[model samples]
Target: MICLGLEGTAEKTGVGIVTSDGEVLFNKTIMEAADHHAETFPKLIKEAFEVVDKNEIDLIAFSQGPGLGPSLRVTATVARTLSLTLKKPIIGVNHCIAHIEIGKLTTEAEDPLTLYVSGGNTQVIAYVSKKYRVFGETLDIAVGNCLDQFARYVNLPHPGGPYIEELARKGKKLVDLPYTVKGMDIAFSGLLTAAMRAYDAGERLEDICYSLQEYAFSMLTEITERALAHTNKGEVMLVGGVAANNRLREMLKAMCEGQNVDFYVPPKEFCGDNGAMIAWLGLLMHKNGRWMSLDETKIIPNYRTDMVEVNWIKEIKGKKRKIPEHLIGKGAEADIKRDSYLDFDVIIKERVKKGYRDERLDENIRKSRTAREARYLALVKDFGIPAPYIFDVDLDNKRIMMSYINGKLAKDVIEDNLDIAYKIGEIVGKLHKNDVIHNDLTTSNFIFDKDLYIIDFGLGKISNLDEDKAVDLIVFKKAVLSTHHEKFDEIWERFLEGYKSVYDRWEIILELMKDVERR
Candidate 1:
């Protein structure tokens, strides 16, 4: 069967026709600086029909969203018209997932952790259970938007990444910038504002651009690494428009190399918005009996990637790389080793330097995080939290010596030991009650050794704000939704129960968590 896909989710308007054999018969995309979907769609569609007759197209698919209302409406209207005229079945595909599908089709990467960075989206995604779960994403503005806005402010160029990359190469000074990463998510608004401020403050454009890329890309790489550590995916794929940036690719490439995983990127054409991706994903969906009626063709402007019911990928059994035998544990940013401190069982964790990050930025992060982790570990003990006893702190070398707990990670046993969920909730409640926000609250951060012991305070902070507490819970919720999805409802219910028992303002925090999730 042949499928036709229309892509007008953003500035790029594209049309493509693909066959069941995964061959792209016709793929063409046109850039519209302004709103030209209404004008470009007709010409692109006509050109696609010229390559493959309209009668030969058995299915029609269009990007159904996470896009602008006008762009989506035009794309949907064109798709509906094409479907009616050709008497073909139609379906709506997610724009983000389409990027992944086309990348897979072109690169042949089977179960990769996808880092999708575009003008409108930035998400770290992986195929888990039956859906493409979003492991991490942008907290505020998208990375591309941040860069473009900065470019516009600096009067560099329209599409800023290329110009920024060129200027960054000549940069000698590594200026200060805000590097924000909360577990698997990141934010760029601070970095964007800081860059603009630096420009206003008479900083060199080259140096500002350099520092901007360094901080933003490093943050992105760190979150992607966290997701990679959590999922243990064997391959990493870079997709979307931002994937075109060599510095960004280099950062991911270095991180992947250090993690012992393969990295892949499709051709530049496939990396950006194009209809071939939609057509290919549509073929996959249609082959699995996914079809939509005309009523269902209405646009969903905020359609999330995970909201789609994925019927194509049945099981993702990619061969994962094993942790080296010598190392006790390897996390996103640290290497754990079993050590003996004065005849006591202890763990030595070192915050290793990332070759991808700027030297100054890397050193700052290592020293600050090392000091912060040690301080938080000791501080939490006063709150009756079960954390490793701090034995020593080596700030110069970025190492922490602490007592080791003999137990399995909660992630490995949470399914069978659902009772631990309640304890986890209790621990979190107590932490929040005492003004401690555990920014990285994934199952992997807890160890079940007779008692639930929380670990990894690398991102923890002292915050009494309800908004911070809510964000803390939301992070854990996202972690559970991705890792313990099967028992998510039961686990979350027990967690809430435990939370309410300790924290009197649980309801308010839960409500705030809901509000934060919408953003």
Candidate 2:
């Protein structure tokens, strides 16, 4: 499919043509990347149309804000017109996401922590859970806005970055400026005001420029670094007009090196407010089944980056699995969904994010715990303990795919099939002999497959301590005594015969096991 995209969030009217298979066929611009939207946007639509076969376009796309109100309205109007004329679907993409997606296109970075610094916006962004979340942002004016305002004070060029960089080169003496960074947010308006005040108070203008760059760039670098520390993103990317500054790039490069992140910036053409970014993201989203109805395409004047919902990523959310009478297990920590993979029955163990916890802490806990469980699954095979064969893992979604075990709970199986009790005992005894602790060793955790199988090892951990092993037996005993007390004596006798076969350290374990139950 082919998509024609329009971009004018900052008044630099540009158009792009992109194919579904990742091709940028045509991209053209008419104005300086600035605030001249009402004057220049419409003039280039016809010229842009001439660059590509209008009949070949299958979709219409546009920048959906996080910029000026007037600019977005004009871009949206053009997009709607094209959508109606072409009789195609329209996709309103997040402008910030456009920046990152385009950066990904022009560079080697795939999953990058993007530093999107433009005249109207500043954000440290990264994709997490089907959304591009801003890790840090400017509390007040953006970096480009502060620099432009400072440039106006010095009577430099209208576009201030180049002038500032050149003037800053003359800065030999550094006038100390206010270094402002607060947790994940930074305030550049204060520094901008201080720089203007310094010029009026007879401090050398060059020194002021030098100090401003040092302070502002450091603040950006520090915030980006902190964001990298939190996200651990392997790539760091830059976008927007402000990305052209050499000193800023060098500072970010130094920080990237220190953080061991691959740094990337697009060639000047793709970095600025360009339609190519919009076109590419639109194709990506549209092919992934994202569509915008005319009613949903209403202009969002003050659209923030994080406010835009990402529909490109496909995930089964707020929906139950499609299976025959299958209402699988669920809990506060994780959910077990019964599904099929590669035509084979499988269980998808998804570690859900806890809303009760802080968002970052929740992501970390989910990620770490998922890896921890996968680590144990890979570890236990060497010790000859049986477990479901792991098929795949999706860390981003916190999902694990494994062979599904079919059986009644061991707690319900003792009287129904008495020999299963002996097998359960022997399995635990093998695990205990291997010095691996099944932190949750209840009968409910056991399943009566052809052979007794242990499942739900999320809480399982590795420990050689006898006390911990004893607690495992203690928990299993209590679970049976509480739930199936009438059959406890019969089950206990058979289970002990199998239990002592492998575990020669049975006396100490039972002693501690009894003490644990009493407590």
Candidate 3:
């Protein structure tokens, strides 16, 4: 399948044509005059078609957001109109995602933390659970925007990056700029203001510029490194216009080298706005069958990278496995089914909530809850916590049935053998050791055949706090005491032993448990 992609969300208007086999047939870019996109974009699209036959194009792709509103409107209008006229599908690709995709293509970095720093955006991102999550980002203006403003303060051009970099390279580091990095977030507005003041205060331009770049870039790099460390990713990718700066690139490379991780930057042309990157991303989305609607096309100026859902697994898997007819089960919200086509048995949880509870509100809340549960389950799985494997989610019906564990309920097992009460404490303790709280730790919430199996995370939340962990234990203790008081202490002690075996922090948990008892 052939794919034609358009990028007109900024100063550079790009047109790219590619084939189904990852071949770039044509890529073109024309820098538009300030605020002239509405006037020039349609002509550019026509010209692109004139160069390449229009009939052969299978899909039309366009950058959807994270850009100038006016410019994006023009691009969206052109693509939507053309798609309607040509009877082709139009796909709206996230501008930030396109940046990361192009960076990945250029660097061939497997699971790298992407530092996307441009005039309008500054974010530290890593691909986690099939989506790019922003580990840290600018709280105010983007780093590149800050630099551009500083350049204007020093009597430089409108796009002040080049001038700032030139000045920075020529000077020595002197003025100490603010380097503020919060937990998974950074503040650049204050630092930018300080840099501008320092530059205007008769401070040496070179020293000030150098210091500003060093300070800001260091903050960015620090966050990027932390993201990599957090995600256990071994590669760092530098993308966006600011990434082209020689000083910044050198600093990042040095840092990566010291940390024994791979660092890469695309060619200078690809680093900034270009048609090739959009075309490459278009091909990726097209191959992965990601398409958008003409009516749904809209611009988001403050679009966030983390907000983009990680559909990596879905993209790679292509066609969704249909839920098996035999495994369908009716629930209060929806029907659950097992998808037999996949490697593992997957229970499809569908939302079929009652219309009486405000249909729209009920559907939205149910869908949100299902998604949140899936995400929490994935995180718990990463920590080696045993839980049901979520196969698929059916949004139409507000229900989620995971792979059915082949075990009897702990409640049933305890009924047969009263001594089994001791095992409940052991299971709860195991969860606490991992700083996990099973908010609903009733005997009915677990399964026990040979190995203990915990289930029903309708109220699970993550916490390392001793009080929370202890309260979780207390909840389990109360459940066992109320239901099986004859063996409560035995069960609780065994649970503590199981928990202490994995995590040494049980002493703190015990202290908190005693405090709870006193209360």
Candidate 4:
């Protein structure tokens, strides 16, 4: 799928198309400073559409941001109009994180501790508990703003970070500057004041520029290191326009090696504000089924980067489940997770949809099998079996909600605790005696409290045939040999002791177990 991205959140206006695989295409942009954007918004948007056909565009995306009001409003308005006209859904993106997301596309970092610095913004961010939380931020003017204002004060040309870097290369003295890092946040205004004072106090301009870069970038790296230590994330990344600074890159790289974490920086084009990043974030969210109505599409000029819901970070392999949390046990047919049922802990097994079959046919099979498993579990209750109490069958989500068994899974404790292994084999024989052939008969399907419980009846079926009962025992034996092999004879004998103590007709099943084990 393809997304058309509009970026007019700042002085430059950019339009581009990005594919789902993180490729940028058909980019047309103008970096002219501070235009009467009201006149060129539609002109800007129309130019983007001219490069690609209506049939190719599946979604429209634009920078929704922490930026100037009119500039942000223009892109939002153009994106809204284009989405309505093309009958495509729209996604409002966070401009700050589009920088990091683009960096991630080009780099190998995953879950990086980021230092996002630009002319208008500066923050230290990390992903924690389903949110890209802001650990620290600028309490006053940004670092890039400090540099630009310094350049302008010295009568240097506008867009001044590069020029400052050059002058810093020539600096001879170590002129001191304010290095302010309070708790987790950085304060650059104090440093800006000191730098301007030095120039006015007749200090050498070379020392002032060198000290400013050293002091401010040092503050940034310090705060970023604090976050990295706290989060223990293995990757660190530098993003935003000011991240292009050579001094800043050197300091951050040195810190990264000392801490032993990989570092990343985007190409110059993506490091600055661009439409490709927004376009790619659009594709990321759209692929995960995120959508917004026109009413919810309003521009947020002062939108905090933390306020935006980062759908892109939650899942990398596939869609993240919105359910409260994922639990310990899961398998091929469904994902097992924890949920509250009637104010108490419960288990949820959602039957994952199969892609190999027809959609409607798969849905029917899922529901049918779900109902059968629920009934079997319910019948286990009638037989007074020590299994999970089936409290619910959620038909809509194709899931089963049941009592949360609070015991250790037998597989985990089986080898060390041979008593649990004995219980496991005994229970499989008991299940077979009751004409229930558990198709997935393994130690993983067993949990022990005071008594044994056999769970995951999805593959189970009713059978009076002796061979089916023998297969159930045979499957459990194979699992034991694979996992608890050292004491196999002792464990299996104790299990048969328990099974024959309860079931009268154990000889034939044991005879077949031998036959099946040999085969």
Candidate 5:
């Protein structure tokens, strides 16, 4: 059996043919400016059929979302026409998931944590509970767009990453830029603005480009490491167009080595947008009895990765990260060790140094995060929120001494007792009411014993804006969607009800969350 895929999610148009036995018979892609997908798709498909006859194809598939409308519509039309004419099954696959599927297919890295960075997307994802759960992502514009736009601003070529990389090789000065990382999520808009301003202020172009790549790549590496540690995955994989950046790949390689995790990336062709990925994903889904009828092939511009039901892998497998013996708990950002503070049993949380980052940048991040966590852990107590009591703080070593709550992590126990989820929503709502945002809202951050307690404020902040509160809830929502997949709908409804109970204007926040998700 053979499958032919049509791919026009963005400016790139691709057509490819692959066999059921995982062999690519033909693959070709082309890029054109706006409003040219229709013309390009025919030529690509013609080339594909010349290599392999049209009668040999058994299935037709296309990239069906999270992209520009014109591109999606054109691709869908071509795919539907071919499916009907050839009398074959049709499938519509998520564009983001296709990138991951092809990476795993080519690299043979089973269940690795994925850092997918492209011109329009940046996300840290892992296979959790039958879906590709987004562990972290960009909060603003994507990293590729940030670089490309900056390049255009400085009179560079169309694709800016390679040009910026070349200029950075000659740069020696380290210019400061705003490094905005909220938990696992990153914001690149500020960094882009700062780089542009530096260019206008007579700073050397090479230095600005160098600083930009360093800061941006470091943030991506840090978040990828954080996600790896949290999921305890043994392997890391890089995909998408921006994965071609040599500096980014080097940084991630160092990070994975430091964490004792294996790293992988496909060849250049498979790394970017291509029809082979779409065709391979289609074959996987079709073999698993998943396909779309012509009526169901409508485009979903805001299609999210977690929304797909991944039925191909029966059991998700990973090598698993081995934690050190001395550590009682190994979180994404800190190491927890059992200790005592003045006759009281306490836990020592240390913000360990990251070897993947520059020495000074690592030091600044660790020290500032340690101070913020210490301050907010104590401050939230005044609002009557259940949190760990701060016993002492060691600033120079980036450690905090706090009372340890002997309880199982919520991720481990939330399934049996879902009432805890509602209580969690209420507590979070209370925190928001008091103008505190728990920037990191993963299930691992909650502990459930006799009563629910929130811990790990390494990403917490004091903010009164409804936008911040909405983002906080969305972070928790993604956490639940990823970790608690089977009962996600029920758990989220209960959580929303509880949140509404404490906050009167809860609908406004929900509306804002919807807007943010669409963005």
Candidate 6:
């Protein structure tokens, strides 16, 4: 099948025409400082078709969301109008997922962690089941966003990644800013804020930019290492516009080498927003029987990954069902359905292993697990981590009742809003410094409303030991590499800057962690 794809999520407008056999007939990008979707998108699409001989396109694919709202609306409107007029099937591709999908198609990686870093995003991700799960991400502005902000401070261009990279090459590292990395997340807004302060205080621009990239990139490397350890995967893929930077590519290549993992990057053109990726993904979805109807054609500016229903859930119900509250719904554990309460949306997890154990032992185990989970939840709340509020714990039943945090999953947000990827890292750094370890730190465990929240504390624990802290850091690194291996170092460095701000004793912890590695 032949598909035409449109991408006008931000400043650049791209149009691509691709065949089912991975042939790119035309792939064009038009970079503008402001809105170009309405004016440039159709022209670009028309231009692409003009170059190709195919008269009738089989499908129309477009970037759905996770981008500027106005920019996305223009593309979606055009795509909808064109699809209806052409009588072609339409598919809305997740911009972030397309990054991974195109990378996979280009590199032919069977199962690789994809690190997506761009002007608007920085995140570590992996495809689990049918949806992408974010293992870790930033808590505030994306790494690219931070870089751009810093670039503006230095009086550089609007898109800062390339400008910063250029200046970094000519400069030497001087400042030792905070390097923070939480369990499986990090933050860059704080670092950006600090960098701005230092710059305003007469710090050398080149050195500051260089040091920012160095420290931020280093944190990404460390987090990738942790991600690899957690998932035990060896392949990594880099995606997003920021992947075009040479420094980020070099740093991640070295990190992947040290871990004996294969690292792959898409061609420079493919790294940025392009229609070819969307069309390429549309081809894959088409093959997999993934098609959208005109009735389902609605724009989702804040779509999330975990909101998707997996095949297993459908199989279990013998029909399609979203994630069950009892199994995966946020804060479903906390609702109390009183006789007077008529409208309540919540899930109750029933504890069910009592028959296998002696009465005394069963009680002890149930109580312990319940208490542990509850305690961890409270600690995370105290630390200001984005987590569900624990309302009650039924120790006898081995169930936890908590507030239902209504939000999109971090993975989905990243896919739509690639900029949120860097913000995810900042959140993880905060969690680690508080001596809290999120046992199952994956993309699915993160909930995003206005801010990102870390969820799923089934394996969480608290400890002040340097060994424990170091291991915590390593876990995130492994997860990053295992899920989002591209630009691993850049993500890791951002994480470190966030982490060091809270846990300045990372040196001791890192040393101890290295010892554990030797063992």
lDDT of 4 by residue, 1-519 (tens): 999888877777777788887777766666623355545666766676677677779988889887887678777887888898988889988887787788888775666788999888888887766767776667667888989999999878878889988999988866756555544566787788888999999998888888788778877876787666556577788998898898789878877776567778988878887888889888887788788788887888777766877676655521112222344322135777899978878998888764333244346657766876887777766555778888889877888988888888887776677787667656665676688766656677878778878777765677898876776676566556645778788777777776776667889878976785542
Best-matching candidate per lDDT: 1
Q: Model-by-model lDDT, in order?
A: 0.86, 0.76, 0.68, 0.75, 0.85, 0.69
- Report RMSD (Å) for each prediction in the order shown: 3.0, 20.0, 19.7, 24.6, 3.7, 18.5
Candidate 1 vs candidate 6: the TM-score winner is 1
1-519: candidate 1 lDDT, tens digit per residue: 989989988788998888999988989997833258878788888888787887888999888887977778888888889898988899989988899889888988887899999899989998876788888899888899999999999998788889998999999999888677876788888899999999999999899999899888888888898788767689999999999999999889988887778999999878898998999888899899887889987788888777998888775566676656445433347888898978999999999887777788899889888888999888988877788999999989999999899999888888888888888898899999998988888888889887888878887778899988997888888888877888999889888887888999899999988898776
Error of 4 at 424 (Å): 55
TM-score of each: 0.89, 0.59, 0.59, 0.59, 0.84, 0.61
Indicate whether candidate 3 or candidate 6 has the larger lDDT: 6
Reference-based TM-score, model 4: 0.59
Candidate 1's C-alpha lDDT? Answer: 0.86
- lDDT tens digits by residue: candidate 3, 1-519: 887877777777777776766566777777634257656667766777777898988788778777876677777777778787889887677788888777766566655678999988888877765666666677567888999888888888878888888877787545656555544456787788898788668888888887787778777766676555555566788899888788778767766766557787876656777655666666676566566666666767656665665453343321122333445332133455556535666566555553223233345546655765666665566655567777655556556657666777776677566445555555566666667676657777767656665556644566778877776766667666656667666666665666666667778878877886652
Assess candidate 1 and give its TM-score to the true structure.
0.89
- Those runs of model 5 whose alpha carbons end farther than 4 Å from true positions after fitting are 32-34, 84-89, 198-203, 229-232, 287-292, 306-311, 314-332, 337-347, 381-394, 401-430, 442-455, 480-507, 517-519
Count clashes in each candidate, considering only residues at least 3 apart in sequence or on different chains.
0, 0, 16, 0, 0, 76
lDDT of 5: 0.85
Tell how far residue 494 is off in model 2, in angstroms. 52
TM-score of 3: 0.59
Candidate no. 2 TM-score: 0.59
Candidate 6 lDDT (Cα, 0 to 1): 0.69
lDDT of 4: 0.75
**Residue 495, candidate 2: how far off, in angstroms?**
51
Name the best candidate (by TM-score): 1
